[PDB]
């Protein structure tokens, strides 16, 4: 028993991490087949980070300007191009550690593991969620750009995130693996702010189902609610409105426990209106919203990779 914020095993992604140095600046790249993916601002100096013209900074660089090291071995760059906000550096050697993989663009409310890296060396792994405002509450320092977020399905690594920047509030922003930012941010040190955020209701509900599975159930009650009446309460507390797809996605957990999704919404309503009165749920005094229903089933069933 038990329920923890669990990350995916990182081994398959560790072997794809490389260091990219473009003069004085160094960040991390992702080596899959004969391509190395990295944030484009590796080509910037500190005087350029404000409002860089990346197209003009790129033309000044040639293949030999990019130093790519995979541990104790250097990869010759034999080509370079820019796709949105990432560079694609073609190397003369396909990565022998390339896993089965996909590039996916995730939706707000979905989770992934991050392998934090510095100088091409992995340093930590932790679990994140794409917040409704398209930021992630990560833990990243200078030099972490190019760290990636991923999910694993059986033996296939689904890469969904590469890290680029930190916002003034201390949250983080990055792109998919095609170089498109999540949210309206830009790889620029101009004025930017994350928009209003909300709590991911469908994840809170999944986590309450996880609690029940594990014998933590004091919040269960004999009441019920309609979806519309619940959503009025949800917006009052800056929770994401629940759409019936969310309800569908919670179907497997409702069937496992015999608790109708709308009855669990009734328990969530009372939690929002009356608090937890110093009680805890799965060790937490707040309502946790960074477990998806898939995360719950994955953990509570012991799926392996």
């Amino acid at each position: 028993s038990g329920f923890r914020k669990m990350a995916f095993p990182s081994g398959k992604v560790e072997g794809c991490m490389v260091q990219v140095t473009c003069g004085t600046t160094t960040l991390n790249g992702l080596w899959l087949d004969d391509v190395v993916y990295c944030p484009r601002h590796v080509i910037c100096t500190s005087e350029d980070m404000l409002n860089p013209n990346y197209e003009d900074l790129l033309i000044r660089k040639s293949n030999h300007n990019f130093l790519v090291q995979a541990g104790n071995v250097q990869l010759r760059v034999i080509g370079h191009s820019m796709q949105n906000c990432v560079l694609k550096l073609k190397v003369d050697t396909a990565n022998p550690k390339t896993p089965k993989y996909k590039f996916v663009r995730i939706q707000p409310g979905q989770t992934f593991s991050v392998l934090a890296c510095y100088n091409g060396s992995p340093s930590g792994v932790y679990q994140c969620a794409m917040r409704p405002n398209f930021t992630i509450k990560g833990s990243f320092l200078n030099g972490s750009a190019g760290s990636v977020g991923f999910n694993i399905d059986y033996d296939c690594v689904s890469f969904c995130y590469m890290h680029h920047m930190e916002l003034p509030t201390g949250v983080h922003a990055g792109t998919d693996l095609e170089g498109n930012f999540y949210g309206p941010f830009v790889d620029r040190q101009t004025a930017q702010a994350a928009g209003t955020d909300t709590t991911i209701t469908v994840n809170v509900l999944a986590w309450l189902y996880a609690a029940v599975i594990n014998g933590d159930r004091w919040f269960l009650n004999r009441f019920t609610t309609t979806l519309n009446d619940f959503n009025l309460v949800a917006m009052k507390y800056n929770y994401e409105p629940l759409t019936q797809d969310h309800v569908d996605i919670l179907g497997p957990l409702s069937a496992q426990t015999g608790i109708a999704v709308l009855d669990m919404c009734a328990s969530l309503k009372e939690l929002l209106q009356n608090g937890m009165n110093g009680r805890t749920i799965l060790g937490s005094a707040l309502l946790e919203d960074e477990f998806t229903p898939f995360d719950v089933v994955r953990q509570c069933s012991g799926v392996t990779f």
Partner: peptide, 6 residues
């Protein structure tokens, strides 16, 4: 504080 490219 300004955004920081990391």
């Amino acid at each position: 504080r300004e955004p920081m490219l990391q």
